[PDB]
Amino acid sequence: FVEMVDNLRGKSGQGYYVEMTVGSPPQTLNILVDTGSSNFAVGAAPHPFLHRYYQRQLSSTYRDLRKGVYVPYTQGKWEGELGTDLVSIPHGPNVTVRANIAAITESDKFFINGSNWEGILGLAYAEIARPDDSLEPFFDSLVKQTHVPNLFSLQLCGASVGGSMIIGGIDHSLYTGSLWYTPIRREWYYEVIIVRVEINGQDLKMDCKEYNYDKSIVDSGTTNLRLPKKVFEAAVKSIKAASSTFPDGFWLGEQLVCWNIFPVISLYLMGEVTNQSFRITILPQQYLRPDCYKFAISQSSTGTVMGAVIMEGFYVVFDRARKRIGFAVSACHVHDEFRTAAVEGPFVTLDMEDCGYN
Numbered sequence: 001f002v003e004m005v006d007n008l009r010g011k012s013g014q015g016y017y018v019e020m021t022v023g024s025p026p027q028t029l030n031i032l033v034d035t036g037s038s039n040f041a042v043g044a045a046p047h048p049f050l051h052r053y054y055q056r057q058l059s060s061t062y063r064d065l066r067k068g069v070y071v072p073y074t075q076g077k078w079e080g081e082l083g084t085d086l087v088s089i090p091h092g093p094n095v096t097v098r099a100n101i102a103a104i105t106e107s108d109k110f111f112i113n114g115s116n117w118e119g120i121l122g123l124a125y126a127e128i129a130r131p132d133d134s135l136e137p138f139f140d141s142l143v144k145q146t147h148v149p150n151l152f153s154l155q156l157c158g159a160s161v162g163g164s165m166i167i168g169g170i171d172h173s174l175y176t177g178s179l180w181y182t183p184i185r186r187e188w189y190y191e192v193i194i195v196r197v198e199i200n201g202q203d204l205k206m207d208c209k210e211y212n213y214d215k216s217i218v219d220s221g222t223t224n225l226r227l228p229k230k231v232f233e234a235a236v237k238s239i240k241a242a243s244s245t246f247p248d249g250f251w252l253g254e255q256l257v258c259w260n261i262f263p264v265i266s267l268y269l270m271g272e273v274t275n276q277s278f279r280i281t282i283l284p285q286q287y288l289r290p291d292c293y294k295f296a297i298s299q300s301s302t303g304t305v306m307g308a309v310i311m312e313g314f315y316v317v318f319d320r321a322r323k324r325i326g327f328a329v330s331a332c333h334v335h336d337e338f339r340t341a342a343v344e345g346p347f348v349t350l351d352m353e354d355c356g357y358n
């Protein structure tokens with residue numbers, strides 16, 4: 001899948017985007033790759049910050065679904081007008097598909113002043129599609145209308161950033177060692193189960209249910225590694241102890257600071273087999289973001305969010321066909337001379353089911 005290697009671009013902190021075309025003739029747009037949502041939505045009006053937008057009036061293949069959508073989220077929101085049209089991906093598979101498209105008509109704190117993307121591609125499942133599961137997501141529509149295998153993978157590499165979205169398969173050149181797989185728990189977000197956490201090899205020893213309170217997901221849409229309040233509290237306390245060789249606001253992402261004094265962080269994830277897990281390990285070069293750095297770990301109320309902090313350490317395979325997600329050491333991650341990002345197993349971990357939440 002070399003046709004698709006390096007098909008992702010971005011600016012530090014503004015997400016990864018992939019080139020797409022909408023309509024006939026085809027209108028090129030940059031679209032942010034978001035495994036944390038399920039809507040395909042593009043700017044359709046001349047917002048001041050946009051470089052380009054979907055002009056439905058120029059598209060012969062556009063169809064109106066005569067319905068609107070309102071997507072509040074943490075801060076702020078987008079609204080748009082539902083329709084369908086022919087979507088293609090220049091550096092993806094050689095296909096065209098009729099997909100649902102929210103034409104974004106009003107917006108608040110959604111588009112970024114400075115960025116180079118004007119739409120979002122939600123890669124998660126129908127269950128969290130807006131306004132409801134009846135709105136078939138792009139990838140569901142892709143697989144239905146073609147022989148493209150039900151699978152995609154991302155290697156996020158990280159002003160300018162880059163990466164690869166391999167649609168329909170796996171590019172082995174993008175990783176080293178073996179892939180290890182965690183089960184997708186429920187097909188809405190990409191939910192998984194964290195079974196253990198270690199800072200510099202030292203278990204946090206928390207009820208593992210607290211690691212998935214009330215959710216843990218894989219989110220290319222997030223920059224941070226985001227932990228639930230309790231966990232993060234313990235997480236940071238332990239990171240602080242490890243790093244005894246900084247002001248409290250910093251740890252809270254209220255201020256900035258300006259490698260080896262820092263502890264590697266390990267997540268054990270539920271394995272494919274009963275009482276079996278594996279672990280992914282990241283370096284400070286990953287949770288310390290650019291000499292001023294931001295502490296890229298942060299408390300959360302929505303659960304654990306495995307964002308670019310995690311994802312930029314690994315080649316991540318979203319194997320929808322088998323309801324599972326694989327992690328491999330990324331052949332691009334930034335590592336120094338001593339520590340390296342790692343994916344290791346198997347381990348024996350009892351009672352992994354209990355780490356889940358209901």
Ligand SMILES: Cc1cccc(-c2ccc([C@@H]3C[C@@H]3c3cc(=O)n(C)c(N)n3)cc2)c1
Pocket residue numbers: 013014015016034035036037073074110112120219220221222223
């Ligand atoms: C990394 C980055 C930078 C700038 C903007 C975003 C971004 C902005 C909006 C969204 C749309 C609302 C849905 C959404 C909201 C949201 O809060 N998250 C974490 C995700 N993954 N998706 C998704 C991602 C993401």
